[PDB]
């Protein structure tokens, strides 16, 4: 009875569509129509960070807003002091095709990973002093696209085998495995409370997961192409996605709907990175046209354009205190704006 | 008074840069290759975990070959990593289902990608003995063979059928039909004919890489 299951699934998705179209009593634009506009926002490159030989695929801020890690496909992790533009560490990797890097909230660990299907975990605060590898977590089938810590003992990884995983670093084992994406899972973002996370794959679908119940809660559609970036809203009741269809979209977790699209007629390049401000009123987005637009989140108006990279920007991150935004790009340069 | 704390930072950074310079000079002295192919294509014959790494040295020049082992057949997200390589080695079984047209479609997609516009291809058309012994024993799958005539640059070895030459030159022209329609001097195509066992392929990759680097330099000076 394959056809019966097909028609059951279609009846179910039509019931979901009916349940969603009854809760859209008004649009976000109709409610934020009277808010005063944010004003044109102009940032400047405070610091430019040089030292990487090749393209930068990943950066992650530290939780103290000074230290910053970056990954280059020449095979080096570098931890920078952004206030002084000093390289605090420089870690040689074993496989050069790094594609993700993360920073532990405690500050004693850094995780890399890429086309080797392994997530390595480096110890920065070691008894001797030089940065060695603590664990190499094998067990994925495809490349490692993202990874985020939870504590110094847990880490969630996203992969090209259509699977997210939860790891226990002391054992090297896979606690929970997350299944459901039919395409390569390209991004993650943890909630502020570390009880959920949302992932976006190359099937135009974002899914919400329960880290302790190990199950998928809601599924969000609306994009027309692959989802490259996901960032949570500052309170954990929304998130924003970037796609290859040159649009960002804003979804709600309690309405189970999409609220806003951030698109322009002169934008035909895909989106790489996404970030919210500390207030959540601006949405920063990096594009393949080497720029970074700054949107009004409560509206759909562009408040500024960060210009200055001469290749594909692939990385964004706003600090925990909200002082700076840091961009990396395929021109092997990091920039800090303010 | 914490210049005590800042001079230590400057010293650590100085040591990091003096090592990064050595890493730079060993990075830019090495060439990187992406071995790409299909199943049953002879990609493993040329070699003789998501990434397999092969290191070798021809004429005191260090090459670094990579082969994607444990990845799925999606390719549109991890092939963007292998821009900024010298060449993409592309292996094709030139001999059930049409694998020749599929290799053609893959070559077309690699050629016209927005990020691989600057990367060139060393085309290896494998399995020439099989092609020969099948043509003496192609028109069903490609209707323009009976229309096709052997090129003026036909240079077979002494002892060759005039009809196997035509098959292999037809396949080469079918790849050059794609590589010629776009690019106009940012990336190139280096087609070659290889059998099962022959050791000239390493020297061929060496020569093609020399040509690629020379063209890069002549383009920096705006002479090409």
């Amino acid at each position, epitope marked *: 009875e394959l056809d019966q299951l*097909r028609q059951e699934a279609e009846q179910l*998705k039509n019931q979901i569509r009916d349940a969603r179209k009854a809760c859209a009593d008004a649009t976000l634009s109709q409610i934020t129509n009277n808010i005063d506009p944010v004003g044109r926002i102009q940032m400047r490159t405070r610091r430019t960070l040089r030292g990487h030989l090749a393209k930068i695929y990943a950066m992650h801020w530290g939780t103290d807003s000074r230290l910053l890690v970056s990954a280059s496909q020449d095979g080096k992790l570098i931890i920078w002091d952004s206030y002084t533009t000093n390289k605090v560490h420089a870690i040689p990797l074993r496989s050069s095709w790094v594609m993700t890097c993360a920073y532990a909230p405690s500050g004693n660990y850094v995780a890399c990973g890429g086309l080797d299907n392994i997530c390595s975990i480096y110890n920065l605060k070691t008894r001797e002093g030089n940065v060695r590898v603590s664990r190499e977590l094998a067990g994925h089938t495809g490349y490692l696209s993202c990874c985020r810590f939870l504590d110094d003992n847990q880490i969630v990884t996203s992969s090209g085998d*259509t699977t997210c995983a939860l790891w226990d670093i002391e054992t090297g084992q896979q606690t929970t495995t997350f299944t459901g994406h*039919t*395409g390569d899972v390209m991004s993650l973002s943890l909630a502020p409370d570390t009880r959920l996370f949302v992932s976006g794959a*190359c*099937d*135009a679908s974002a899914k919400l997961w329960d880290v302790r119940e190990g199950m998928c809660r809601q599924t969000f*559609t*609306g994009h*027309e*192409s*692959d989802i490259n970036a996901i960032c949570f809203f500052p309170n954990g009741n929304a998130f924003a996605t970037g796609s*290859d*269809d*040159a649009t960002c979209r804003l979804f709600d977790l309690r309405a189970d709907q999409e609220l806003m699209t951030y698109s322009h007629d002169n934008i*035909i390049c*895909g989106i790489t990175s996404v970030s919210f401000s500390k207030s959540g009123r601006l949405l920063l987005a990096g594009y393949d046209d080497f720029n970074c637009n700054v949107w009004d989140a409560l509206k759909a108006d562009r408040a500024g354009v960060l210009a200055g990279h001469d290749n594909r920007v692939s990385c964004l991150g706003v600090t925990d205190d909200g002082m700076a935004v840091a961009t990396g790009s395929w021109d092997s340069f990091l920039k800090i704006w303010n | 008074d914490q210049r005590n704390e800042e001079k230590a930072q400057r010293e650590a950074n100085k040591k990091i840069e003096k090592q990064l310079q050595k890493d730079k000079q060993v990075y830019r002295a090495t060439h990187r290759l992406l071995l790409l192919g299909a199943g049953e294509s002879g990609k493993s014959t040329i070699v003789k975990s998501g990434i397999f790494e092969t290191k070798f040295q021809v004429d005191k020049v260090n090459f670094h070959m990579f082969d994607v082992g444990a990845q*799925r*057949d*999606e*390719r*549109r997200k991890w*092939i963007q990593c292998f821009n900024d390589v010298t060449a993409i080695i592309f292996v094709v079984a030139s001999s*059930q*289902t*049409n694998r020749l*047209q*599929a290799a053609l*479609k893959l070559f*077309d*997609s*690699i*050629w*016209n*990608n*927005k990020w691989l516009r600057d990367t060139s291809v060393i085309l290896f058309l494998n399995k020439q003995d099989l092609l020969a012994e099948k043509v003496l024993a192609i028109e*069903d*799958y*490609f*209707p323009e063979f009976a229309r096709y005539t052997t090129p003026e640059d036909a240079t077979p070895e002494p002892g060759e059928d005039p009809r196997v030459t035509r098959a292999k030159y037809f396949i080469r022209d079918e790849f050059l039909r794609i590589s010629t329609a*776009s690019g106009d001097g940012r990336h190139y195509c280096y087609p070659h004919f290889t059998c099962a066992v022959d050791t000239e392929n390493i020297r061929r990759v060496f020569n093609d890489c020399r040509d690629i680097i020379q063209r890069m330099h002549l383009r920096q000076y705006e002479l090409l």
Partner: nanobody
Amino acid sequence: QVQLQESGGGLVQPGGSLRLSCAASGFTFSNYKMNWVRQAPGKGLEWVSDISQSGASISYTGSVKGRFTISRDNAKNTLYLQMNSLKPEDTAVYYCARCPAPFTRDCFDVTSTTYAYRGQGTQVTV
């Protein structure tokens, strides 16, 4: 949601004809390049025909040139295939595949076993 549903398959006397159709929903049909793939019983997914954003460039595989015809109707969001002079070697389930990203001259992984922007198929048995 991206949705592609094909229609028109059936049993055809060898030498007959069919007109397959593909309705698309969830995206701007005019920004993409569209495809037809094919899965014969016991064999892999092969490629039949593409068409550009405006139907200017059209490519066919070798064993369908002169017989098949592709066409778009961007206002009606429908893609077509006209199969003429059918052979027993054409018995396969036919899909309507869409290239992943818009405005791109290339598109990659259409004949993959797990491809997202592909319909569920329709059966033609000559």
